[PDB]
Write a protein that binds this ligand. Structure first.
Ligand SMILES: [Ca+2]
Ligand SMILES: [Ca+2]
Ligand SMILES: [Ca+2]
Ligand SMILES: [Ca+2]
Ligand SMILES: [Ca+2]
Ligand SMILES: [Ca+2]
Ligand SMILES: [Ca+2]
Ligand SMILES: [Ca+2]
Ligand SMILES: [Ca+2]
Ligand SMILES: [Ca+2]
Ligand SMILES: [Ca+2]
Ligand SMILES: [Ca+2]
Ligand SMILES: [Ca+2]
Ligand SMILES: [Ca+2]
Ligand SMILES: [Mg+2]
Ligand SMILES: [Mg+2]
Lengths: 223, 222, 223, 222
């Protein structure tokens, strides 16, 4: 596009291959509490904040919301379990795509409702020189999280951008929904186990099978 | 069955009010230079007025509406809605309520509506059916559909567990709220959307109208 | 409707509760031949003639069509297995609905590509006085079968009817597709294990959960 | 990989001919008092001319077209199609073919088209790529897409099993034919339909264009 200034990347399943760990950790911590959240459902709910994920389960199974102390207790258990796995590595193609974006004079940004500190603290070491602190959105900015467009709208505000000056790179239907409802052109990369139809149904303007094929295709789609 | 209660949505289930709500949202947004189509208003059916306004601002302006903007637009919408000849009952709603009540079940209303003209007409339209203590309205909720909050609140007011209730809904966000509350949810497709959207939202059954639901009730509850 | 003259009923899963048997028999006969057709896939393919069902499997698994002698051999094995089960009983609500249709001066018809003779020979005993021989479509009329609209168009021709003078009652997505592509108002009854969305996606104008609820609702929908 | 061959559809994959086919079908049907929209012509992409004509007759007239009707309508459609400036290559098709050939794979064409002007331009557009003995056209088939017949015939002509080939298709009925042949099928969404329809038909991968497929080929074949 001719108007493009910024590329807004989600983190889990776009920059880091972290979803096998998040899905396993959510499934196991819920099971420890006698609550049912399958690994597949964890993928379906990918994009929600920790508080929202916990509340989905509490609301359907226990008929109430979690209290804040329950949210914090369960999230801390989930985070400990996530961190017990060998640390998540970069999605293949992410670094190469970021280099391309930057070389073209575009501003990369990260937009996530993650509170998984061990990942956030590794962004610079994994993608050196790509991201600016003042141009990032994390759990420490967000009140609602995806699928609310709030995090992407916050990224636009931080960047001094209009929606038509950005592209979102997302991999999960709730994350695509947030980008789309922010009015931003959204590219889905199907890096999980779900059908690509769910990404398109959520509003993705393009769909690719992987970050590496997006990288391979980037110059063509931006022409 | 351990069925004890039937939780009815109001707009498009008890009253034929959606042609009016969709028109009024479309028109008031148009007055403010914002594009909200009648079809889109149906897609948003279920949300509170404040949430509806915010979502349009988020997409079209890249920001949340201010509290002032929400109050002003909603005030205009309510005036316009009430300028139409008052909404009539959905055919079949009263017959179904008599059936439910005759079977010893407790009718409840669950809505994020704060439309006083409709809420204060419930008793006159469905005499003896509903009680303020057994209703959830805009005045009870923080989030509203599609959050299961209002249905969970109704369960609590009724002293119910989710497996003791059935929800009757007509809109995808409403079906989603009932389903995410863990409650068996029957969709009645009383609007212009494809029924697939109601099933996709988690409806356990789909009927084309309140009258066919009424006709079919004793069979499905066997 | 004010134009309605005829109601065109499918047989399997609408008049007879025969689909648990057809699906099991197809699955088992294919397994005997070292071919994969799941019970769920048998439901997905409900509506196809025997030759078509066999060819779906041969084409995807063996890279060719079945010969006619193979089709007849395998179909006869399937029919023997189907007939080894206690004979299929009426769908609850079918007889009551047919009585209603007839009392309203509508002409009931049967439209099926089934060659399962044991069911066809039982139609009169199960629904006495409802159907006319000259106003039926079976495997012995059809060249292609559902999802081709051919069988429903043949029913219209036999009945001296225009598409707008009939209603189809179907329960399977390929059968709904045939009715819809014949230009006929089609009511789906979800009497199997599939999602109702598949019936609606195929073109059904109404969807009910069972023959008994259709029966309960018939006078309302025809007003 | 035991990959040996790449089976290309023609219209909307090798040539940008679908704006012309859809317009010509729409117009010729209109001349005969039959409603076939341009969008519907895209939905039917893949079918042989005879099948396309029959389906419209079945829905609108309640009968099959006669052989005479099929021959007359098809004759008119072919004349109209060829009255447009001849269709150009899909960007990326030639580069992809060079890549495929360089990797030792056998290109094939699989189509129910009998459009001689396009079939007889294959060699001039893609020199050295294709051979008549390794093609399937309208002149080979009894049924055509979405029956897997044409893909199965291509496998046979190439001495292939289904696990030794990849199909490149752009239309839902074409994807369906490849998938029902048991062949890995890549959809390229080069028309106006939603990509969900291509995935619903059984595509294993979806790309937005022939050029992005070309760009991505070496990565997906790793
Ligand atoms: Ca993600
Ligand atoms: Ca949503
Ligand atoms: Ca999967
Ligand atoms: Ca789309
Ligand atoms: Ca409603
Ligand atoms: Ca509609
Ligand atoms: Ca369902
Ligand atoms: Ca059937
Ligand atoms: Ca079809
Ligand atoms: Ca099921
Ligand atoms: Ca429909
Ligand atoms: Ca094509
Ligand atoms: Ca389109
Ligand atoms: Ca798939
Ligand atoms: Mg949702
Ligand atoms: Mg098909």
């Amino acid at each position: 596009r001719k108007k493009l200034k910024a590329v807004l990347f989600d983190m889990d399943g776009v920059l880091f291959n972290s979803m096998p760990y998040h899905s396993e950790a959510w499934h196991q911590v819920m099971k420890t509490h006698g609550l049912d959240l399958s690994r597949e459902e964890a993928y379906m709910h990918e994009g929600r904040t920790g508080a929202s994920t916990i509340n989905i389960v509490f609301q359907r199974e226990l008929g109430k919301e979690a209290t804040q102390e329950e949210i914090e207790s369960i999230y801390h258990e989930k985070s400990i379990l996530f961190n017990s796995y060998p640390e998540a590595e970069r999605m293949p193609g992410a670094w190469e795509l970021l280099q391309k974006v930057k070389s073209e004079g575009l501003t990369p940004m990260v937009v996530t409702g993650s509170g998984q500190l061990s990942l956030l603290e590794r962004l610079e070491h994994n993608f050196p020189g790509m991201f600016h602190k003042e141009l990032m959105v994390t759990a420490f900015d967000v009140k609602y999280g995806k699928p609310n467009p709030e995090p992407y709208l916050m990224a636009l505000k931080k960047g001094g951008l209009k929606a038509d000056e950005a592209v979102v790179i997302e991999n999960a239907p709730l994350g695509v929904e947030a980008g789309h409802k922010a009015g931003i052109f959204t590219i889905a990369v199907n890096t999980g186990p779900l059908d690509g139809q769910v990404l398109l149904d959520a509003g993705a303007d393009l769909l690719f099978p992987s970050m590496q094929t997006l990288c391979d295709s980037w110059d063509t789609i931006m022409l």
